[PDB]
UniProtKB/Swiss-Prot annotation:
It is found in: Cytoplasm. This is Cytosolic sulfotransferase 16. Optimum pH is 9.0. Belongs to the sulfotransferase 1 family. The active site is at H128. Highly expressed in roots, stems and mature leaves. Low expression in young leaves and flowers. Barely detected in siliques. Changing V309L: In strain: cv. C24.
Length: 322
């Protein structure tokens, strides 16, 4: 296949890259371009470099994992499609949001025949690729992008708990404290996390008309103004009639944690139906809170990561942005 040709082409290169143990005993992460990768994800990056073609009308969802990706896939899909479906007919009621917004470095690489990637109408894509490594076609298209980030303490806990749920990996996971130590040293997939955020922040600073820079915690506290802003930014702003008819509030409720978690499609061990999964859909909806780290980390571990944040973000403007 075309992806198998990519894998062969970069085999020798990827073998020359530095390698490290991950959070599972047998897991090997590879370093490239300041960031750590699973092998297949780095193959997926090069495949996208060589083959992904962005259009100016595309809209790209960007995040580091466990900062709000599922939520933004739902929101962007609902914003785009709200006039295509009667409320009860919305496909989000029936299928996990990841089925509707394909990943550049995963779905486009590993699963290029899924229906949404064959749909010439679809404008929505997502990625965890660091900003400095995005394919030139994406950079050159001028397509707009949204980036979301989250408190590193909550982001870490979201990841460590999620990884207990991966198929055929029971017991294969480092302790909380050892996992936290490698997260803080920047050893995580797509990490270092703080470098990931800073990369998009600097892009936002340089191109503030092209990137909407969002924070999980402020959206969670007060989602309606942010959803309206996102829809506007996307080019699908809510009209005055729509606001009269509560349509923006309907989108917020449909994409809320409380709705999606309780859908039949996202419960139990049910998996997505478009392509193979190593997670049940239910693994994407855990607690949805701000501050759950308080139940796992000591003041000493909090001070460590909070000190890393102050040092990484010093003099950048990031923590001031509202
Ligand atoms: N619709 C939604 N609104 C808000 N948070 C959501 C959400 N759907 C999922 N989440 C939360 O977002 C995190 C997953 O991030 P991602 O989608 O990037 O993998 C999890 O956080 P918690 O593990 O803290 O519950 C998950 O519960």
């Amino acid at each position: 296949t075309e992806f198998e040709k990519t894998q062969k082409k970069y085999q020798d290169f990827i073998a020359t890259l530095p390698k490290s143990k991950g959070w599972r005993p047998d897991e090997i992460l590879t370093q490239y371009g300041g960031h750590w990768w699973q092998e297949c994800l780095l193959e997926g990056l090069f495949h996208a470099k060589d083959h992904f073609e962005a259009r100016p009308t595309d809209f790209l969802v960007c995040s580091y994992p466990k900062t709000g990706t599922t939520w933004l896939k739902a929101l962007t899909y609902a914003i785009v499609n709200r006039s295509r479906y009667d409320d009860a007919a919305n496909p989000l009621l029936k299928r996990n949001p990841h089925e509707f917004v394909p990943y550049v470095e995963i779905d486009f690489a590993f699963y290029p025949t899924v229906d949404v990637l064959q749909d010439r109408k679809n404008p929505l894509f997502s990625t965890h690729i660091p900003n400095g490594l995005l394919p030139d076609s994406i950079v050159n298209s001028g397509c707009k992008m949204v980036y979301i980030w989250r408190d590193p303490k909550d982001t870490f806990i979201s990841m460590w708990t999620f990884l207990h749920k991966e198929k055929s990996q029971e017991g294969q996971l480092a302790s909380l404290e050892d996992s936290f130590d490698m997260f803080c040293k920047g050893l995580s997939v797509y990490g270092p996390y703080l470098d990931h955020v800073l990369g998009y922040w600097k892009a936002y600073q340089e191109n503030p008309d092209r990137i909407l820079f969002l924070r999980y915690e402020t959206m969670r506290a007060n989602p309606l103004p942010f959803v309206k802003r996102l829809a506007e930014f996307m080019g699908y702003g809510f009209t005055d009639e729509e606001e009269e008819n509560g349509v923006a509030e309907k989108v917020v409720k449909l994409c809320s944690f409380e709705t999606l978690k309780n859908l039949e499609a996202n419960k139990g061990d049910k998996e997505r139906e478009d392509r193979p999964a190593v997670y049940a859909n239910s693994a994407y909806f855990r607690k949805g809170k701000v501050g759950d780290w308080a139940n796992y980390l000591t003041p000493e571990m909090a001070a460590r990561i909070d000190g890393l944040v102050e040092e990484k973000f010093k003099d950048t403007g990031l923590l001031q942005h509202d």
